[PDB]
């Protein structure tokens, strides 16, 4: 008399197949790429030109002496 089949309690689990967790698509990408890229170029011309100012300063001490 002690056999298995239970009265209730069932799901089931799915046979489904989906995980569309997107994801900033469709022209939202290529937008964070370009602006941060020119931001790095914007970081230039305030350092290389600044080091160029120090570069003439470095060559200044050479020319002032040597007579």
């Amino acid at each position: 008399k002690q056999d298995m089949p239970p009265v209730g309690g069932y799901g089931p689990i799915d046979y489904k197949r989906n995980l569309p967790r997107r994801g900033l698509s469709g022209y939202s990408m290529f937008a964070v790429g370009i602006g941060a890229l020119l931001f790095g170029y914007w970081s230039m011309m305030k350092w290389n030109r600044e080091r160029r100012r120090l570069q003439i300063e470095d060559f200044e001490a050479r020319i002032a002496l040597m007579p």
Binding site: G23, L24, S25, G26, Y27, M29, F30, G33
Partner: protein, 59 residues
């Protein structure tokens, strides 16, 4: 009965190619997917220390 899997024609319009162009060029694929499903490292290692621990059996 039937099911036709991997049977789907592409979109081929102006905007949806930008989802397939950002995929190849900037790799929004292969990192959001495959760099996150590996890590997934923080789970507990289910290893039996055999000379000390032992596994289950049946009568």
């Amino acid at each position: 009965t039937y099911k036709y899997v991997n049977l789907r024609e592409p979109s081929m319009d102006m905007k949806s190619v930008t989802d397939r162009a950002a995929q190849t060029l900037l790799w929004t694929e292969l990192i959001r997917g495959l760099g996150m499903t590996l890590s997934y490292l923080f789970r507990e290692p289910a290893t039996i220390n055999y000379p000390f621990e032992k596994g289950p059996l049946s009568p």
